[PDB]
Symmetry: C2
Subunit: 219 residues, 2 copies
């Protein structure tokens, strides 16, 4: 396709408080995402308190990047990203700012899945055995492990689609696990495609992740 593609990178949770390999975590993420030339614009969703750090980080980069303030939930912040998208935007990729190890290949794979799908997510087969349990803390059943996947990021969507879904989401009293669950809640015929992710594509939040992350770079 020749469509305009937007990337929204969220850093509006705990924000920048984090640095691994002598680089702020968001910068590593930013580095990787800025090399994906298929992506026409990058929108950072940030905490207002980190505005100065962010402005500074963005000086290092040329090309189409800008930021907007996040909000009080994950979904409210994403929607702030969505409203900020270029009017030309036809496809949107989303990615956690605190997942710095997503390879360029993974962003590319997520994007290429948009050729024939309107919704795409990344996920990996769970290495830990899952059980579904009941409300009395007894096992209900053990799902087939070959079909149990843990989601990560990036995700990507037809921009008009997910925007309309987000608008319906905010008019509702529904709670969702992630954006792709919206296609279930709002009875969609649109199938959500899964792209195999990377086991090294971890979230870096705790103090130990940082240590682990410093070691991973060294290997």
């Amino acid at each position: 396709d020749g469509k305009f593609i937007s990337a929204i990178i969220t850093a509006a949770g705990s924000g920048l408080r984090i640095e691994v390999g002598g680089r702020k975590v968001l910068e590593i993420t930013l580095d990787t995402v800025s090399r994906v030339k298929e992506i026409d614009e990058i929108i950072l969703v940030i905490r207002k308190d980190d505005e100065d750090i962010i402005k500074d980080i963005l000086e290092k980069y040329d090309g189409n990047i800008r930021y907007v303030y996040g909000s009080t939930t994950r979904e409210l912040s994403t929607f702030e990203g969505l409203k900020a998208l270029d009017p030309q935007s036809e496809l949107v990729l989303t990615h956690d700012g605190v997942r710095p190890f997503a390879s360029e290949e993974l962003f590319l794979k997520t994007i290429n899945a948009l050729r024939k799908n309107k919704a795409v997510i990344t996920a990996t087969k769970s290495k830990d055995t899952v059980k579904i349990i009941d409300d009395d803390m007894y096992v209900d059943f053990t799902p087939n492990r070959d079909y149990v996947y843990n989601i990560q990021t990036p995700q990507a969507f037809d921009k008009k689609l997910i925007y309309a879904m987000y608008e319906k989401y905010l008019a509702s009293e529904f709670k969702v696990t992630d954006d792709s669950q919206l296609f279930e809640f709002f009875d969609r015929d649109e199938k959500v495609k899964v792209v195999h992710g990377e086991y090294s594509n971890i979230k870096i939040t705790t103090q130990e992740d940082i240590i682990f992350a410093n070691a991973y770079l060294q290997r």
Copy 2:
């Protein structure tokens, strides 16, 4: 044994017959992983005996490790799968054994309290497993790599160990398993394969109770210990 559980004799089977003690020795904080585990289990006085299931190649180092312990602790050789190893452990239990707890030798961080909680659940249940609510969001997907559905997140758990069972029951289930062509994810799934109406009780586990197998896990375990 435990007074609240009819004074029934309790056995523990610790499996260390995977890659076993070596991977280069599996060490964390300056101590062999199996030693940290065995240290914890041997402090649980409710457990009447401890059976280690080992690789034959690790026997000499196993003996050296076991000298430090006074208790009713011994070892048998394991086999070629987790399950066949567990069965060697089950065959070696004291004739008086009425309850059996199993635990992975490479899960060194399970607290003593977690073992006690697992044992106390045997008071009213014949099967007990430890598990933790999944912090990562799970999807069930299909053969064409599309999302089938997102399970209700409050009911999605990742299992760990210990697990524990009525001894005759788990032994009988094991004989059925051996005579079958089923493959199980863990021992408690035996209850589903053989149509048991005895329910498997879930005890909240510990997020810190990780398995140590890869070089990554060791890095992670050390960062946890230095925290």
